[PDB]
Amino acid sequence: MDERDAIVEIRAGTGGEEAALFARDLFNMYLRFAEEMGFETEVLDSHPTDLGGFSKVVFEVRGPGAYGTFKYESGVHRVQRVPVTETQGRIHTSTATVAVLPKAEEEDFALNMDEIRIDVMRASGPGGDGVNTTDSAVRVVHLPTGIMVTCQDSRSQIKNREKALMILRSRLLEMKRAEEAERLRKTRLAQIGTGERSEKIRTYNFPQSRVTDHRIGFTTHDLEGVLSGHLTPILEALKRADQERQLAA
Amino acid sequence: MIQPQTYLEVADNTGARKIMCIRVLKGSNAKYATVGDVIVASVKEAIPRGAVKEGDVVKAVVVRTKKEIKRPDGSAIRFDDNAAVIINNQLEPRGTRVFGPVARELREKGFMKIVSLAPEVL
RNA sequence: GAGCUAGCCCUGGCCAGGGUGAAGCUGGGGUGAGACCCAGUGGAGGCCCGAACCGGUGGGGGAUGCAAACCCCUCGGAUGA
RNA sequence: AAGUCUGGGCUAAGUGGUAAAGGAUGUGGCGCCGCGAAGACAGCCAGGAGGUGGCUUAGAAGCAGCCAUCCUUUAAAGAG
RNA sequence: GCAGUGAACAGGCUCUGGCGACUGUUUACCAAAAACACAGCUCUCUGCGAACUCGUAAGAGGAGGUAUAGGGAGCGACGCU
RNA sequence: CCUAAGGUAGCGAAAUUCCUUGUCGGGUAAGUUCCGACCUGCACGAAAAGCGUAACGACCGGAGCGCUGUCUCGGCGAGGG
RNA sequence: CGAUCAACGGAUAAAAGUUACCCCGGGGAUAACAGGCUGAUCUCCCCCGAGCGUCCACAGCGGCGGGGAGGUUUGGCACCUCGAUGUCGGCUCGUCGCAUCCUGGGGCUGAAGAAGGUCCCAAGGGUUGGGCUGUUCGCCCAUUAAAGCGGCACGCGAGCUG
RNA sequence: GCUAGUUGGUGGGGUAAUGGCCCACCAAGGCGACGACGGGUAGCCGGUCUGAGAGGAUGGCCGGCCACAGGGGCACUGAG
RNA sequence: AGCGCCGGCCAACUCCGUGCCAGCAGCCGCGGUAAUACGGAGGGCGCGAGCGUUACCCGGAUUCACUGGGCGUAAAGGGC
RNA sequence: CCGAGGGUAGGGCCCGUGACUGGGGCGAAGUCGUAACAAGGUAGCUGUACCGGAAGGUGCGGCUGGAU
RNA sequence: GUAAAAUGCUAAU
RNA sequence: GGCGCGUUAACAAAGCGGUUAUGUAGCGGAUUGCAAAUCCGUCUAGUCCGGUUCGACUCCGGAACGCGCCUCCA
Ligand SMILES: [K+]
Ligand SMILES: [Mg+2]
Ligand SMILES: [Mg+2]
Ligand SMILES: [Mg+2]
Ligand SMILES: [Mg+2]
Ligand SMILES: [Mg+2]
Ligand SMILES: [Mg+2]
Ligand SMILES: [Mg+2]
Ligand SMILES: [Mg+2]
Ligand SMILES: [Mg+2]
Ligand SMILES: [Mg+2]
Ligand SMILES: [Mg+2]
Ligand SMILES: [Mg+2]
Ligand SMILES: [Mg+2]
Ligand SMILES: [Mg+2]
Ligand SMILES: [Mg+2]
Ligand SMILES: [Mg+2]
Ligand SMILES: [Mg+2]
Ligand SMILES: [Mg+2]
Ligand SMILES: [Mg+2]
Ligand SMILES: [Mg+2]
Ligand SMILES: [Mg+2]
Ligand SMILES: [Mg+2]
Ligand SMILES: [Mg+2]
Ligand SMILES: [Mg+2]
Ligand SMILES: [Mg+2]
Ligand SMILES: [Mg+2]
Ligand SMILES: [Mg+2]
Ligand SMILES: [Mg+2]
Ligand SMILES: [Mg+2]
Ligand SMILES: [Mg+2]
Ligand SMILES: [Mg+2]
Ligand SMILES: [Mg+2]
Ligand SMILES: [Mg+2]
Ligand SMILES: [Mg+2]
Ligand SMILES: [Mg+2]
Ligand SMILES: [Mg+2]
Ligand SMILES: [Mg+2]
Ligand SMILES: [Mg+2]
Ligand SMILES: [Mg+2]
Ligand SMILES: [Mg+2]
Ligand SMILES: [Mg+2]
Ligand SMILES: [Mg+2]
Ligand SMILES: [Mg+2]
Ligand SMILES: [Mg+2]
Ligand SMILES: [Mg+2]
Ligand SMILES: [Mg+2]
Ligand SMILES: [Mg+2]
Ligand SMILES: [Mg+2]
Ligand SMILES: [Mg+2]
Ligand SMILES: [Mg+2]
Ligand SMILES: [Mg+2]
Ligand SMILES: [Mg+2]
Ligand SMILES: [Mg+2]
Ligand SMILES: [Mg+2]
Ligand SMILES: [Mg+2]
Ligand SMILES: [Mg+2]
Ligand SMILES: [Mg+2]
Ligand SMILES: [Mg+2]
Ligand SMILES: [Mg+2]
Ligand SMILES: [Mg+2]
Ligand SMILES: [Mg+2]
Ligand SMILES: [Mg+2]
Ligand SMILES: [Mg+2]
Ligand SMILES: [Mg+2]
Ligand SMILES: [Mg+2]
Ligand SMILES: [Mg+2]
Ligand SMILES: [Mg+2]
Ligand SMILES: [Mg+2]
Ligand SMILES: [Mg+2]
Ligand SMILES: [Mg+2]
Ligand SMILES: [Mg+2]
Ligand SMILES: [Mg+2]
Ligand SMILES: [Mg+2]
Ligand SMILES: [Mg+2]
Ligand SMILES: [Mg+2]
Ligand SMILES: [Mg+2]
Ligand SMILES: [Mg+2]
Ligand SMILES: [Mg+2]
Ligand SMILES: [Mg+2]
Ligand SMILES: [Mg+2]
Ligand SMILES: [Mg+2]
Ligand SMILES: [Mg+2]
Ligand SMILES: [Mg+2]
Ligand SMILES: [Mg+2]
Ligand SMILES: [Mg+2]
Ligand SMILES: [Mg+2]
Ligand SMILES: [Mg+2]
Ligand SMILES: [Mg+2]
Ligand SMILES: [Mg+2]
Ligand SMILES: [Mg+2]
Ligand SMILES: [Mg+2]
Ligand SMILES: [Mg+2]
Ligand SMILES: [Mg+2]
Ligand SMILES: [Mg+2]
Ligand SMILES: [Mg+2]
Ligand SMILES: [Mg+2]
Ligand SMILES: [Mg+2]
Ligand SMILES: [Mg+2]
Ligand SMILES: [Mg+2]
Ligand SMILES: [Mg+2]
Ligand SMILES: [Mg+2]
Ligand SMILES: [Mg+2]
Ligand SMILES: [Mg+2]
Ligand SMILES: [Mg+2]
Ligand SMILES: [Mg+2]
Ligand SMILES: [Mg+2]
Ligand SMILES: [Mg+2]
Ligand SMILES: [Mg+2]
Ligand SMILES: [Mg+2]
Ligand SMILES: [Mg+2]
Ligand SMILES: [Mg+2]
Ligand SMILES: [Mg+2]
Ligand SMILES: [Mg+2]
Ligand SMILES: [Mg+2]
Ligand SMILES: [Mg+2]
Ligand SMILES: [Mg+2]
Ligand SMILES: [Mg+2]
Ligand SMILES: [Mg+2]
Ligand SMILES: [Mg+2]
Ligand SMILES: [Mg+2]
Ligand SMILES: [Mg+2]
Ligand SMILES: [Mg+2]
Ligand SMILES: [Mg+2]
Ligand SMILES: [Mg+2]
Ligand SMILES: [Mg+2]
Ligand SMILES: [Mg+2]
Ligand SMILES: [Mg+2]
Ligand SMILES: [Mg+2]
Ligand SMILES: [Mg+2]
Ligand SMILES: [Mg+2]
Ligand SMILES: [Mg+2]
Ligand SMILES: [Mg+2]
Ligand SMILES: [Mg+2]
Ligand SMILES: [Mg+2]
Ligand SMILES: [Mg+2]
Ligand SMILES: [Mg+2]
Ligand SMILES: [Mg+2]
Ligand SMILES: [Mg+2]
Ligand SMILES: [Mg+2]
Ligand SMILES: [Mg+2]
Ligand SMILES: [Mg+2]
Ligand SMILES: [Mg+2]
Ligand SMILES: [Mg+2]
Ligand SMILES: [Mg+2]
Ligand SMILES: [Mg+2]
Ligand SMILES: [Mg+2]
Ligand SMILES: [Mg+2]
Ligand SMILES: [Mg+2]
Ligand SMILES: [Mg+2]
Ligand SMILES: [Mg+2]
Ligand SMILES: [Mg+2]
Ligand SMILES: [Mg+2]
Ligand SMILES: [Mg+2]
Ligand SMILES: [Mg+2]
Ligand SMILES: [Mg+2]
Ligand SMILES: [Mg+2]
Ligand SMILES: [Mg+2]
Ligand SMILES: [Mg+2]
Ligand SMILES: [Mg+2]
Ligand SMILES: [Mg+2]
Ligand SMILES: [Mg+2]
Ligand SMILES: [Mg+2]
Ligand SMILES: [Mg+2]
Ligand SMILES: [Mg+2]
Ligand SMILES: [Mg+2]
Ligand SMILES: [Mg+2]
Ligand SMILES: [Mg+2]
Ligand SMILES: [Mg+2]
Ligand SMILES: [Mg+2]
Ligand SMILES: [Mg+2]
Ligand SMILES: [Mg+2]
Ligand SMILES: [Mg+2]
Ligand SMILES: [Mg+2]
Ligand SMILES: [Mg+2]
Ligand SMILES: [Mg+2]
Ligand SMILES: [Mg+2]
Ligand SMILES: [Mg+2]
Ligand SMILES: [Mg+2]
Ligand SMILES: [Mg+2]
Ligand SMILES: [Mg+2]
Ligand SMILES: [Mg+2]
Ligand SMILES: [Mg+2]
Ligand SMILES: [Mg+2]
Ligand SMILES: [Mg+2]
Ligand SMILES: [Mg+2]
Ligand SMILES: [Mg+2]
Ligand SMILES: [Mg+2]
Ligand SMILES: [Mg+2]
Ligand SMILES: [Mg+2]
Ligand SMILES: [Mg+2]
Ligand SMILES: [Mg+2]
Ligand SMILES: [Mg+2]
Ligand SMILES: [Mg+2]
Ligand SMILES: [Mg+2]
Ligand SMILES: [Mg+2]
Ligand SMILES: [Mg+2]
Ligand SMILES: [Mg+2]
Ligand SMILES: [Mg+2]
Ligand SMILES: [Mg+2]
Ligand SMILES: [Mg+2]
Ligand SMILES: [Mg+2]
Ligand SMILES: [Mg+2]
Ligand SMILES: [Mg+2]
Ligand SMILES: [Mg+2]
Ligand SMILES: [Mg+2]
Ligand SMILES: [Mg+2]
Ligand SMILES: [Mg+2]
Ligand SMILES: [Mg+2]
Ligand SMILES: [Mg+2]
Ligand SMILES: [Mg+2]
Ligand SMILES: [Mg+2]
Ligand SMILES: [Mg+2]
Ligand SMILES: [Mg+2]
Ligand SMILES: [Mg+2]
Ligand SMILES: [Mg+2]
Ligand SMILES: [Mg+2]
Ligand SMILES: [Mg+2]
Ligand SMILES: [Mg+2]
Ligand SMILES: [Mg+2]
Ligand SMILES: [Mg+2]
Ligand SMILES: [Mg+2]
Ligand SMILES: [Mg+2]
Ligand SMILES: [Mg+2]
Ligand SMILES: [Mg+2]
Ligand SMILES: [Mg+2]
Ligand SMILES: [Mg+2]
Ligand SMILES: [Mg+2]
Ligand SMILES: [Mg+2]
Ligand SMILES: [Mg+2]
Ligand SMILES: [Mg+2]
Ligand SMILES: [Mg+2]
Ligand SMILES: [Mg+2]
Ligand SMILES: [Mg+2]
Ligand SMILES: [Mg+2]
Ligand SMILES: [Mg+2]
Ligand SMILES: [Mg+2]
Ligand SMILES: [Mg+2]
Ligand SMILES: [Mg+2]
Ligand SMILES: [Mg+2]
Ligand SMILES: [Mg+2]
Ligand SMILES: [Mg+2]
Ligand SMILES: [Mg+2]
Ligand SMILES: [Mg+2]
Ligand SMILES: [Mg+2]
Ligand SMILES: [Mg+2]
Ligand SMILES: [Mg+2]
Ligand SMILES: [Mg+2]
Ligand SMILES: [Mg+2]
Ligand SMILES: [Mg+2]
Ligand SMILES: [Mg+2]
Ligand SMILES: [Mg+2]
Ligand SMILES: [Mg+2]
Ligand SMILES: [Mg+2]
């Protein structure tokens, strides 16, 4: 949580080429704010538009307290301005989404052989007196989940027991990777949603040099400073309305 | 003499028409069920929208047997079908009516609501 | 050595009984004429059922056999290559 | 077939007559310390306290985890 | 009369997959099948003393046939390919 | 990058799928088989044809009804031994 | 002088496969079954006590290591048997072992009761019927006091099945 | 496309009374694009609502008629 | 004495709040920092023991056209 | 005899539901291309046929609702 | 009759 | 497990005992209203460990991972 490093997933929202450009404005804003926090950044996945923006950027913020600070950015950020892609001079309202994820463990997976039952038995099919009399077939059962793997690929119980455990581990792992991925998915959709013009967490109105965080009501007018990284006023104001939410009973 | 695979008519209004005994609930391995014994059964045939439906695994008490029942007085009684009344795990009937005669052995085995509901006790 | 067996050649013989009912023909309808429809007649077919005859499906028996391939029940073909 | 032979000792497990780490007031024999009528060891009979806790902990306040383990009448009483 | 093809001879049925179109054929004597064959499709050879086959040859088959024919090969009713 | 060129239609856990009793659905009280789907087809695929197909089959699967000494579970009787 | 006659004391100048259509002569000199020896693998039991268990090593557990038992599995070896020791499963008929699934007797419990956990004694008896698959095994259904695990040539084909 | 009491006849049965209403038999007829048969829906009208009217919609109360009396069938009694 | 309404249709408007949010909506459409269109307020309009909404029928719909419509290119001449 | 109904067997119609599958309508942003509207850069459209990620392309015949 | 190198441009009166 | 092949930069992929591979991308410029296309330039390397050699991406041995083939008579 709060003290671990953080992954920030910036994705273009409704807006097309201008959402992607604004996504890069949100991108540069976070990289700078990281510097003014002693935090280290590193880009893991970048999808540039030939216009200069990013349809998606994923980067980590490395340093004690990253998920503590950056966590208040997960949501939909609305831009209202005259796009560089606009030619009739109109104001368009585009969106970009920010997703904040605490950095994960690549925790290694190994089998607790004490929760694994190994059955040996006669195999099936050809073999003559061999297949009739040999306990070459192996079933391995993951007793907690109940899933089993069977192998009679070879004549050897030892080789078949090894291949069975291999496949069993590979299948449990794919289950464990799938749970964490479904958990990641729901978490992500909670923060990002559809990315529609509603759902917004913060507005950046360039005509009015206004930056409004409709979660707490904090408005500033240093839109240039905000976009240059100076986000600390908003965070603290969010941080304080957070603690004022934690006034109980 | 009922056993697994035996078909029984349902002498009540639960919706079930034919049940197939799958177990004789009388100890570890009773071979046979007679009047007043409970069985587990599969509901093989039912009328639409009844309480129980086809596929349900139900309990019932056997009320009539084609194998005659012998009685301490030297008499016997025999029915034209094998019939059972579907009950719950508390031995109470699940329907509200009992169709046809039932064996008086049900009384002495604590199936009094069923005996009551039955139009004749023989 | 083809008196067993396989194929072919020549010349004879055999296939109870029952069932289905093609074409055609006749009549009627239909049309400009037709197609075609209907009924009757008709008797086609590696058509149907089933003996003989030719087989040998499943099971049982037999296993120093009645028999070095049989017996019983059952079963396939039976106008056709 | 030839000693119920002789002398000294050990074993009580039928060990002898089927095995290991390891465990044990089994038994016998050695040592080498130590404490003892400055009355020992065991039992019994008192005292065995206090400022009362010091960090963390609404009590853990002598008798959780942490910190070091000050001192009085004293014959001896650890903030155990 | 319990019972009338009163004895004997005389289909159990249905739903749904695979394979093979079908009737046929086969390992005499452990396999009858999804195997072989089959009409049908295609490729190919062959102008006639044909090609091809048997034979050292002569001579035969092909065929007393002639490319709508004869040999060889694969595929295997039919449908859509 | 490589190849002569990189499997089309149709079909697919299949007479083909190792993992496999794949997964989902159906049927069952309960279905490693069966049927219908799905498609990462270990290792289908177009005359060693591909995919279908009415009818046919002593072919090989799956299910139900009928009926039963197959069975629970055995009993008695007959005749040849 | 001409040899990767390199299978290097070099069969010809000149040589690949397949057989489940197979055959003969041999071998238990040598594999596959079973036995045997062994016991790495397998199964079971201990030692140590790091740590878990709010507290508390030891109710229940046991890091890193250590010592054994058994002779069900998978192997190693190739010792009787290749002038034959018929091999899976099922069926039938059992009998033995006990490391005990149940029932009987117990100690400890983080045992209120009830119900369990764990270990000890105990082999007298008992240990069901189904769906799937040839299956052994395993899963599932419905029950049960319980639905034990092993040996007997993985018991039993001059007993049956196939 | 529908039709076997189906459509007609004759003779009867039944009814207060006509009739295939029912029956035996004779004939092979009867209905249908002017919609038979089947399916859906609906008790019908006086009236009511609306509409410039024509139309449309509708059938609640009130009046008239029909139909039904838990779901079905049946006859007895009776002027009914 | 209350209820509906005051962008246009449609009779009745100004102020603050809000800032494509909250919301309005029968149709055309309102709301993205000077909203007669959202919310309130004041003011106004319409009805009144009612005022609105929802459902449904006729109307407006000559939009099934008999009264009372159409078919070259808008939907619409049958290939002959 | 007829007969409520019950039972047995086979049909018909309708409804709901079904692993999976087919396309369809919709969307203030996505990926691919650019078929049509200007000889829309190959006049277009057309019935049909074959083919291709996709719009489409091409063949045959028709139309002008085709350009200069 | 001949005559075209060349794809694209979201979304706010 | 046996046998064969491989590991190079951003990706794909080569040669080489001494030496900008290459294509595409990326990066600076041009062009364009802008993007693409196009034009001018430009660029990051050899899986680990140990040997041979003056010198190893290149050769030898091992490891690690990946690919391909085989594992039959019971
Ligand atoms: K062989
Ligand atoms: Mg523009
Ligand atoms: Mg184990
Ligand atoms: Mg085996
Ligand atoms: Mg099998
Ligand atoms: Mg073999
Ligand atoms: Mg073995
Ligand atoms: Mg029911
Ligand atoms: Mg059913
Ligand atoms: Mg069902
Ligand atoms: Mg009941
Ligand atoms: Mg009854
Ligand atoms: Mg002859
Ligand atoms: Mg002869
Ligand atoms: Mg003759
Ligand atoms: Mg004949
Ligand atoms: Mg005849
Ligand atoms: Mg005949
Ligand atoms: Mg005849
Ligand atoms: Mg007949
Ligand atoms: Mg005739
Ligand atoms: Mg004639
Ligand atoms: Mg004629
Ligand atoms: Mg005729
Ligand atoms: Mg005939
Ligand atoms: Mg005749
Ligand atoms: Mg015939
Ligand atoms: Mg026949
Ligand atoms: Mg017949
Ligand atoms: Mg024959
Ligand atoms: Mg025979
Ligand atoms: Mg014969
Ligand atoms: Mg038989
Ligand atoms: Mg026999
Ligand atoms: Mg026999
Ligand atoms: Mg014999
Ligand atoms: Mg003999
Ligand atoms: Mg015979
Ligand atoms: Mg005979
Ligand atoms: Mg016979
Ligand atoms: Mg016959
Ligand atoms: Mg016959
Ligand atoms: Mg026959
Ligand atoms: Mg016949
Ligand atoms: Mg005949
Ligand atoms: Mg003939
Ligand atoms: Mg003595
Ligand atoms: Mg002496
Ligand atoms: Mg002892
Ligand atoms: Mg002894
Ligand atoms: Mg001893
Ligand atoms: Mg009589
Ligand atoms: Mg018959
Ligand atoms: Mg069949
Ligand atoms: Mg199929
Ligand atoms: Mg199948
Ligand atoms: Mg055949
Ligand atoms: Mg065949
Ligand atoms: Mg076929
Ligand atoms: Mg066919
Ligand atoms: Mg054929
Ligand atoms: Mg076919
Ligand atoms: Mg025949
Ligand atoms: Mg026949
Ligand atoms: Mg034979
Ligand atoms: Mg033979
Ligand atoms: Mg023979
Ligand atoms: Mg035979
Ligand atoms: Mg065969
Ligand atoms: Mg045979
Ligand atoms: Mg046959
Ligand atoms: Mg054959
Ligand atoms: Mg054929
Ligand atoms: Mg053909
Ligand atoms: Mg031809
Ligand atoms: Mg030819
Ligand atoms: Mg010759
Ligand atoms: Mg010759
Ligand atoms: Mg000649
Ligand atoms: Mg001649
Ligand atoms: Mg020919
Ligand atoms: Mg053939
Ligand atoms: Mg063939
Ligand atoms: Mg074929
Ligand atoms: Mg392939
Ligand atoms: Mg192709
Ligand atoms: Mg094609
Ligand atoms: Mg395909
Ligand atoms: Mg598949
Ligand atoms: Mg399956
Ligand atoms: Mg298939
Ligand atoms: Mg395959
Ligand atoms: Mg499989
Ligand atoms: Mg398999
Ligand atoms: Mg399963
Ligand atoms: Mg199911
Ligand atoms: Mg069913
Ligand atoms: Mg299933
Ligand atoms: Mg089976
Ligand atoms: Mg299937
Ligand atoms: Mg798959
Ligand atoms: Mg094939
Ligand atoms: Mg071929
Ligand atoms: Mg093949
Ligand atoms: Mg081919
Ligand atoms: Mg097929
Ligand atoms: Mg067809
Ligand atoms: Mg077929
Ligand atoms: Mg067929
Ligand atoms: Mg056949
Ligand atoms: Mg045949
Ligand atoms: Mg056959
Ligand atoms: Mg069956
Ligand atoms: Mg059955
Ligand atoms: Mg049956
Ligand atoms: Mg018997
Ligand atoms: Mg007897
Ligand atoms: Mg006798
Ligand atoms: Mg050599
Ligand atoms: Mg040599
Ligand atoms: Mg040599
Ligand atoms: Mg030498
Ligand atoms: Mg030589
Ligand atoms: Mg030479
Ligand atoms: Mg050689
Ligand atoms: Mg040879
Ligand atoms: Mg072979
Ligand atoms: Mg073979
Ligand atoms: Mg032979
Ligand atoms: Mg031979
Ligand atoms: Mg021979
Ligand atoms: Mg031999
Ligand atoms: Mg031999
Ligand atoms: Mg020999
Ligand atoms: Mg040797
Ligand atoms: Mg020897
Ligand atoms: Mg051996
Ligand atoms: Mg070996
Ligand atoms: Mg061996
Ligand atoms: Mg051996
Ligand atoms: Mg061995
Ligand atoms: Mg053995
Ligand atoms: Mg051995
Ligand atoms: Mg032996
Ligand atoms: Mg051992
Ligand atoms: Mg040992
Ligand atoms: Mg060991
Ligand atoms: Mg031990
Ligand atoms: Mg602890
Ligand atoms: Mg404790
Ligand atoms: Mg351990
Ligand atoms: Mg050890
Ligand atoms: Mg040991
Ligand atoms: Mg042993
Ligand atoms: Mg031993
Ligand atoms: Mg052994
Ligand atoms: Mg062994
Ligand atoms: Mg030996
Ligand atoms: Mg030796
Ligand atoms: Mg031997
Ligand atoms: Mg002998
Ligand atoms: Mg001997
Ligand atoms: Mg012998
Ligand atoms: Mg035993
Ligand atoms: Mg014990
Ligand atoms: Mg236990
Ligand atoms: Mg006990
Ligand atoms: Mg006890
Ligand atoms: Mg207790
Ligand atoms: Mg308790
Ligand atoms: Mg206890
Ligand atoms: Mg104990
Ligand atoms: Mg016991
Ligand atoms: Mg079954
Ligand atoms: Mg079974
Ligand atoms: Mg089994
Ligand atoms: Mg198994
Ligand atoms: Mg118990
Ligand atoms: Mg239990
Ligand atoms: Mg069981
Ligand atoms: Mg055995
Ligand atoms: Mg056994
Ligand atoms: Mg045996
Ligand atoms: Mg035998
Ligand atoms: Mg056996
Ligand atoms: Mg024996
Ligand atoms: Mg024997
Ligand atoms: Mg014996
Ligand atoms: Mg013997
Ligand atoms: Mg067999
Ligand atoms: Mg057999
Ligand atoms: Mg009549
Ligand atoms: Mg009538
Ligand atoms: Mg008549
Ligand atoms: Mg009706
Ligand atoms: Mg109705
Ligand atoms: Mg009007
Ligand atoms: Mg009306
Ligand atoms: Mg009524
Ligand atoms: Mg009522
Ligand atoms: Mg009534
Ligand atoms: Mg009534
Ligand atoms: Mg109003
Ligand atoms: Mg106004
Ligand atoms: Mg003012
Ligand atoms: Mg309003
Ligand atoms: Mg309105
Ligand atoms: Mg706004
Ligand atoms: Mg304002
Ligand atoms: Mg404004
Ligand atoms: Mg305002
Ligand atoms: Mg509004
Ligand atoms: Mg309004
Ligand atoms: Mg307002
Ligand atoms: Mg009033
Ligand atoms: Mg209206
Ligand atoms: Mg009108
Ligand atoms: Mg008019
Ligand atoms: Mg008009
Ligand atoms: Mg015209
Ligand atoms: Mg037209
Ligand atoms: Mg037409
Ligand atoms: Mg009736
Ligand atoms: Mg009826
Ligand atoms: Mg439906
Ligand atoms: Mg275009
Ligand atoms: Mg075009
Ligand atoms: Mg253009
Ligand atoms: Mg173009
Ligand atoms: Mg064009
Ligand atoms: Mg065209
Ligand atoms: Mg083309
Ligand atoms: Mg038009
Ligand atoms: Mg041009
Ligand atoms: Mg130009
Ligand atoms: Mg272009
Ligand atoms: Mg694009
Ligand atoms: Mg576009
Ligand atoms: Mg390996
Ligand atoms: Mg390289
Ligand atoms: Mg690379
Ligand atoms: Mg290259
Ligand atoms: Mg090279
Ligand atoms: Mg380069
Ligand atoms: Mg470049
Ligand atoms: Mg550039
Ligand atoms: Mg390197
Ligand atoms: Mg070096
Ligand atoms: Mg080096
Ligand atoms: Mg270098
Ligand atoms: Mg290297
Ligand atoms: Mg190397
Ligand atoms: Mg293998
Ligand atoms: Mg071999």
Backbone φ, ψ for residue A151 (5° rounding): -145, 125
Q: Element (H or E) spanning B8, and its range?
A: strand B7-10
**What is the spatial distance, in angstroms and rounded to an integer, between the CA atom of B89 and the C1' atom of C45?**
70
Give the three-class secondary structure for B66. Answer: coil
Nearest 5 degrees, angle CA A137-CA A138-CA A144? 155
Nearest DNA or RNA nucleotide to B23 (CA to C1'): G142
For tokens 């291999």, what's the residue? A166
Is A83 near strand K, with its CB below 7 A from some atom of it? yes
CB A131 within 8 A of CB A39: no
Which residues have CB less than 5 Å away from ligand 4 (the ion)? A 122-123, 131, 134, 136
Asked if strand F contacts B29 at the CB level, meaning under 7 A, the answer is: no
Cβ contact B117:B93 at 8 Å: yes
Q: Which two tokens stand for residue A169?
A: 């581990």
Distances (CA, A) of A216 to A30, A35, A225, B106: 20, 26, 20, 75
* Alpha carbon of residue B77 to chain centroid: 16
Residues, Cβ < 5 Å to ion ligand 11: B 12, 14, 85-86, 93-95
Instruction: Count Cβ atoms below 10 Å from residue A114 Cβ, excluding itself.
Output: 7
Tokens of residue B70, six digits? 């012998």
| CA B35/CA B92 separation, integer angstroms | 16
Ligand 227 midpoint to CA A16 (Å):
30
Q: Which run of H or E residues covers position B19?
A: strand B16-24
Q: CB atoms < 10 A from the CB of A135, how many?
A: 12
Does residue A81 contact residue A95 with C-beta atoms inside 8 Å?
no
Q: For the beta carbon of residue B76, count every other beta carbon within 10 angstroms.
A: 10
Distance A123 CA to E36 C1' (A): 37
Q: What separation in Å is there between the alpha carbon of A187 and the centre of ligand 241?
A: 35
CB of B82 within 8 A of CB of B66?
A: yes
Q: How far is the CA of A143 from the C1' of G111 (A)?
A: 30
Tell me how far the alpha carbon of residue A226 lies from the centroid of ligand 26, in angstroms: 107
Which residues make beta-bridge pairs with B80?
A: none
Question: Taken in order A193, A195, A197, A201, is the CA torsion positive or negative?
Answer: positive
Element holding B116 (H helix, E strand):
helix B112-117
Q: Put residue A243 in one of left, alpha, beta given phi > 0 → left and psi -120 to 50 → alpha.
A: alpha
User: Cα(A42) to centroid of ligand 38, in Å?
Assistant: 93
Resolution (angstroms) equals: 2.5
Q: How far apart are CA B67 and CA B69, in angstroms?
A: 7
CA B76 distance to own-chain centroid: 19
Strand A92-102 with A6-12, pairing: antiparallel
Ligand 89 centroid to residue B25 C-alpha, Å: 45
Can you read off the two tokens belonging to residue B91?
A: 């031995």
What residues contact residue A215 under an 8 Å CB cut-off, 6+ apart?
A75, A201, A202, A238, A241
CB proximity list for A190: less than 8 A, separation 6 or greater: none
The integer distance in angstroms from the CA atom of B104 to the C1' atom of J35 is 88
Please state, in angstroms and rounded to a whole number, the distance separating the CA atoms of residues B83 and B44: 14
> For residue A60, how far is its CA from the centre of ligand 100 (angstroms)?
49
**Kind of pairing, strands A92-102 and B69-70?**
unpaired
Distance (Å, whole) CA B29 – CA A185: 53
Q: Is the CB of A130 under 7 A from strand L?
A: yes
Radius of gyration of chain A (CA): 27
With a 7 Å cutoff on the CB, does B22 touch strand F? yes
Q: Note the strand F nucleotides within 7 A of protein beta carbons.
A: 18-21, 28-30, 72-73
CA A186, A199, A45, A222 dihedral sign is negative
Q: Where is B24: in which H helix or E strand? A: strand B16-24
Would you tell me how many other CB atoms lie within 10 Å of the CB of residue B33?
26
CA torsion A56→A61→A65→A70, rounded to 10°?
-30
The spacing between the Cα labelled CA in A156 and the C1' in G75, in angstroms, equals 9
The DSSP line for chain A is -TTS-EEEEEEE-TTTHHHHHHHHHHHHHHHHHHHTTT-EEEEEEEEE-TTS-EEEEEEEEESTTHHHHGGGG-EEEEEEE--TT-SS---EEEEEEEEEEEPPP-------GGGEEEEEE---SS-THHHHH---EEEEEETTT--EEEE-SSS-HHHHHHHHHHHHHHHHHHHHHHHHHHHHHHHHHHHHTT--SSSEEEEEETTTTEEEETTTTEEES-HHHHHTT--HHHHHHHHHHHHHHT---
Taking the centre of ligand 231 as the mean of its atom positions, its distance from the CA of residue B47, in whole angstroms, is 61
A146 backbone φψ class: left, alpha, beta (φ>0; ψ -120 to 50): left
Contact between the CB of A208 and strand I at under 7 Å? yes
Distance, CA of A29 to CA of A52 (rounded, Å): 15
